[PDB]
Amino acid sequence: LYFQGMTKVLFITANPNSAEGSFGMAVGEAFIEAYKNEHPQDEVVTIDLFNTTVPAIDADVFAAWGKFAAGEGFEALTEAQQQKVAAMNTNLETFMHADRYVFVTPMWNFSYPPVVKAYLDNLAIAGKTFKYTENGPVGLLEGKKALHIQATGGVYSEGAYAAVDFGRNHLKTVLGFIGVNETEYIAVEGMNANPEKAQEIKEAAIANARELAKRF
Amino acid sequence: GENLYFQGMTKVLFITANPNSAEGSFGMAVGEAFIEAYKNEHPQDEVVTIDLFNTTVPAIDADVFAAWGKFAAGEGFEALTEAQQQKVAAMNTNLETFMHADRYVFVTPMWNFSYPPVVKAYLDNLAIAGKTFKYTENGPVGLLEGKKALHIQATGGVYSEGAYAAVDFGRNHLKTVLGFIGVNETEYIAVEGMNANPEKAQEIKEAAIANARELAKRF
Ligand SMILES: Cc1cc2nc3c(=O)[nH]c(=O)nc-3n(C[C@H](O)[C@H](O)[C@H](O)COP(=O)(O)O)c2cc1C
Ligand SMILES: Cc1cc2nc3c(=O)[nH]c(=O)nc-3n(C[C@H](O)[C@H](O)[C@H](O)COP(=O)(O)O)c2cc1C
Ligand SMILES: CN(C)c1ccc(C(=C2C=CC(=[N+](C)C)C=C2)c2ccccc2)cc1
């Protein structure tokens, strides 16, 4: 074809179990298939954070960032610093070039798996996703939309317990800091607080995901 | 005055989550000052340092779920694979090292409104059912008793009061998990405002260091 432009969607998952053993992954796959049937041509790339190199910010990264500030190039870094920065570049560039993001995270001790924090630490880079201005920082990503699907044993979406929903709230905060302010949230909650009605909660969340896909 | 349970040496855990040292980190410089002041008040208390950037902190992954599945089935430690045995043992080491301690000190910087990811993996190594918490008919309840925790955080801006405290996710999430495992009292020291006010960087650091020395006399 003469034109190669298309909407790029990133299906970012952070759950070790598959869709058959995870409520979050089950609703995540239902939203993706419903989005594909509504949006052909659009590309959907899956990113499993448990099988993706996500370097944590450590002494090598600070040392690598320091040499970059001193005007030095990539060759000045050690081999260990080179492999970490390159993997951080790939994660950042792939996220910046996409248009739609879909996060699937389970709640482990009031927050997400730790690899989600390292992944966000790979995305928040000054000069790339946000810039400093006279009136504080400003996110750089424009024309982006994000969906977060979180599965929790208890119920956190409504009530006072939304204050301890740290995984959901911190993800929304970082997304807005890099310019992704148009977000959507689908809660898959209560399958373990009341196991007798866990399948109804899953089925209701699937219907909630299939409706959002036609307008997302 | 005593004559109850012998001496009972107080174990203190100085848990750091910053790759830089005290010379290149405000939170570490305040954390090191608190320890030096605590050791002078209690010369016989044991202080064990745990650097999370140089400690095996296994993340909950596919091997951990497969291990917990075989443990719940009735099998023992002889059924796991070599990758599962190494991960489960290192989680028990971090768990029992934390449980056997009476005092806890955390030093973290704010990286994008939260802590480094290794802190979350370390907290997931501690919240274990039947060990640090259990579920009752009235709800979950922690099991650790007689513990006192202190969190030192260094942030560029100010997140102590107002609507900016709601986005201090690193401090708040650490308090919730510590309170979930029984440690209901976690004092907090803020080294904040160095990047918002670069001219007050040394004034804020020096004031927070003196605050940590005064707190070390009663902690
Ligand atoms: C290590 C661990 C920690 C958990 N912590 C919480 C929690 O803090 N609050 C909660 O409601 N459920 C908690 N759960 C239960 C999960 O939220 C529940 O399994 C949910 O369905 C997410 O699983 P899934 O995304 O794989 O479907 C925890 C489960 C595990 C294994
Ligand atoms: C990767 C990174 C992310 C940061 N994110 C924030 C932030 O979200 N809010 C803030 O006030 N400061 C932020 N800072 C600045 C540090 O929190 C601040 O300089 C703090 O003093 C660093 O802690 P330390 O000196 O003890 O290492 C960030 C710094 C880095 C390197
Ligand atoms: C069986 N039942 C009625 C329940 C037992 C426990 C829980 C909860 C919970 C909190 C923290 C957890 N963590 C940290 C593992 C796990 C569960 C819980 C979740 C949200 C609000 C209040 C409590 C909900 C229902």
UniProtKB/Swiss-Prot annotation, chain B:
GO MF annotation list: electron transfer activity; FMN binding; oxidoreductase activity, acting on NAD(P)H as acceptor; oxidoreductase activity, acting on NAD(P)H, quinone or similar compound as acceptor
Catalytic activity: 2 a quinone + NADH + H(+) = 2 a 1,4-benzosemiquinone + NAD(+); N,N-dimethyl-1,4-phenylenediamine + anthranilate + 2 NAD(+) = 2-(4-dimethylaminophenyl)diazenylbenzoate + 2 NADH + 2 H(+)
Cofactor note: Binds 1 FMN per subunit.
Any coiled-coil regions, as ranges: none
Any Pfam family: Flavodoxin_2
Transmembrane spans: none
Protein family per UniProt: Belongs to the azoreductase type 1 family.
Name of this chain's protein: FMN-dependent NADH:quinone oxidoreductase 3
Lineage summary: Bacteria, Bacillati, Bacillota, Bacilli, Bacillales
Gene name as annotated: azoR3
